[PDB]
Design a protein around this ligand. Sequence first.
Ligand code: CA
Ligand code: CA
Ligand code: CA
Ligand code: CA
Lengths: 144, 144, 39, 39, 331
Amino acid sequence: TEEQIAEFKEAFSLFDKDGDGTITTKELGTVMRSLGQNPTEAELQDMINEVDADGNGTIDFPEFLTMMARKMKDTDSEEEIREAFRVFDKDGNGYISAAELRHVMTNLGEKLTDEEVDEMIREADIDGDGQVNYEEFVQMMTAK
Amino acid sequence: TEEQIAEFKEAFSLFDKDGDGTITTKELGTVMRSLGQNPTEAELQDMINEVDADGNGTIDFPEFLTMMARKMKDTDSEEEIREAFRVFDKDGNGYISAAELRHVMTNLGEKLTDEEVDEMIREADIDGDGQVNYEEFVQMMTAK
Amino acid sequence: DDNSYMYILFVMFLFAVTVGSLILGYTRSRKVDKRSDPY
Amino acid sequence: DDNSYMYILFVMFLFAVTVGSLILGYTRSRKVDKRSDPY
Amino acid sequence: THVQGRVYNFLERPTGWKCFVYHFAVFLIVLVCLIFSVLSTIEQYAALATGTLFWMEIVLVVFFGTEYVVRLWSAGCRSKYVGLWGRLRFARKPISIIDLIVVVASMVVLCVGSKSAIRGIRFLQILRMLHVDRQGGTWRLLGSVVFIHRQELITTLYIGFLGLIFSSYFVYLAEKDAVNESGRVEFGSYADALWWGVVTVTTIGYGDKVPQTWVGKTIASCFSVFAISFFALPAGILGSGFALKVQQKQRQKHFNRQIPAAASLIQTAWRCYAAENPLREHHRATIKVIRRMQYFVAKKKFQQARKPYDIEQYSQGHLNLMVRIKELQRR
Ligand SMILES: [Ca+2]
Ligand SMILES: [Ca+2]
Ligand SMILES: [Ca+2]
Ligand SMILES: [Ca+2]
C-alpha cells in the first residue's frame, strides 16, 4: 500500500484542474462530461452525498482515500452482490440462462454496451449450458 | 478446586464484619457503598433475589458457592451473550463498527468508563476495520 | 326551505373532497407502465 | 321534562368514564422520551 | 433549573399517581360546569343556574389564566425551544392554540357581560373538554390510520357519493309531484330528495320522507342495498386499522425494553472479564464478588426482556423452527 498512497493524490485533485485539495464535485460534472458521461445535477449531488463521508463536497481525501480503501471483495460486500442474483432467481439453484441474463443485462438499471454484455456471460457459461451460476461469477468478482 | 474452597469463605462473610455465616444483604448496601457503588435498596433487594437461591437473604453458601461454581464460560451462557450482539446487528455478519460499538458502549444500560470503553474494542478490532465481530469477542470472553 | 341551499352545498362538497383526493392520488402516482412488471 | 336531568347526567358521565380512562392510560405510561428509540 | 423542568413534566406529558388526580379533577370540574350550563336551558330547571355559577366561571377563568402562564413559563426546559423568542413555536402546538382561544375568548365574553351574552359561555365551556386530554395521543392514531388507508376510504366514499348523487335524482324524477297521506308533498325539491339520500344511505331511516309512487320504491330498494354496503365499509376498514397500529406500538415498545437489557449484559460481561487490572490489593478482592453478583441480575433481566413477549402465543408458525436450526448448528 506504500507505493500507491502518493501518486493517487495526483489523480485526486486532477478534476479541479488546479493544485487545491478539492474533490471538486462542481467540477466533476464537467470532468465526467468531458470523459463522455454528462449526468444530471441530481445524480451529481448524489455522488459525494455517499462518496464523501465528511459532507462538504470537496475533500483532501478523508473518504476519497477510504473509497480507494474499500476493496469491495471481502465478505462484507460479497453477499450483497450475491443477493442481486437472488432477485432474479426462479426455481432456485441460480438457474440463470444466457438468454435471461442477456434479457436482464441490456434492459434495466444502467445498461451495458452490447460488446460488453455479449462477452460478460462468456466466462460464466464455460459449460455452454442454460445456467450461468452466481458462484462462477462472484469467483470472477472475487478479485473485484 | 480444592485450593479455593477454603479461603473463599473468608471473603464470603467479610461483608458482615463478623464471624457469622451470613451473606449480609442488609450490610451489602454498606459494603458496596464503601467500595464506591452506593445502589438503591430496590436493586439491592434484587441482588440476593436471584443470587441466593435459598431465599432468606444471608446464607452459609448454598448459592454463594454456586455463584462461584458457575463459570459463565461454557455453552450454556455463551449463546446468551452471543444473542446480545444480535440485538445490535444490522444487515447480518456482525457488522458492528468501532464507532457504533462506542455509541452503544457509553450510552445504554450500565455504562463503562471512557478508559474502559476506549480500549474495550481494541483487541476486537485488530484488523483496524469497521467490523468488531462477535466471534472475536466471545473468544476473548471464552475465558470469562 | 329557508336555508335549504346548505344541504346541497355540503353533500356536493364532501363528494368534491373525495374525488379531489382520488385525483391527487392518481397524479402524485409514480409511473404508468402497463406491462413491465414481471419481465 | 319531569326527570330530564337524568339524560344529561348519564351522557356526560359516560364521556367522563372514557376521558378518565384516557388520562389513566397517559399517566400510568412509562416514559416520554421522544427521539431515543432507534438509536 | 430543577423547579421549571419539574413543573413542565407535571403540567405537560404528566406522570405519577398525583398528576392523574390533578388533571382528571380539573376535567371533572369542567364536566360539572358544562352539565349545569346545559341544564340552564330546560325552562323548568333553569332556577338552579344562579349568579354563583357565573362567579364560579370567573374564578375558573382566573385559574386558567394563570395555568396557561405557568405552562408557558415552564416551557424553557425543552431542547426544541428556549428563552422567550423560541417559546413562540411552543404556542404553535394546536392544543395550546385551542387553550389560548378558550381562556382569552371566555374572559372577553365574561367582561362584556359584567359591565345572547350567557349563550356564548356554553360553547367556550364545551371547548374546555378538549384541552385537558393532553399529548394528542388519540388524534395521532386516527390521523395515521386514515392516512394509511387513504386508498380504500377515498374509493368507497367516491362510489357511495356517486350512488347517492345519481340514484337520489331518479327518485326526485319519480316523485316530483305526489302528495303524502296528510296532504303535503315530500320530495318537493332536489334537496329534499338528497336529505333522503343521505338519510337512507346511512341507514337511519327517520321516516319523514318515504317514496310513495311505486317506481321510486324500486329505485330506493336498489340504491339501498348497493350503497348501504359501500357506506358500511369504513367501519370494518378502520376497525382493522386501529387494532393493527396498537400492535405495531407494542412491538417497538417491547423492542425499546429489550435494548437496555441487551446492553446491561455485554457491558457487565466485559466488566467480569476485566478482573486482571481495573495497599491496592484487598480493594480488588471485593470487586470480584460484585462483578459476578450483578452479572446474574443482568442475566435475569435479559431473559425477562425476551421471554415475556406481549397475544403472547405468536410462536405458532415457528414452533419447532427455532430449535431445528440450533440442534443442526450443534452438529
Ligand atoms: Ca473546490
Ligand atoms: Ca467534505
Ligand atoms: Ca446476617
Ligand atoms: Ca437464604
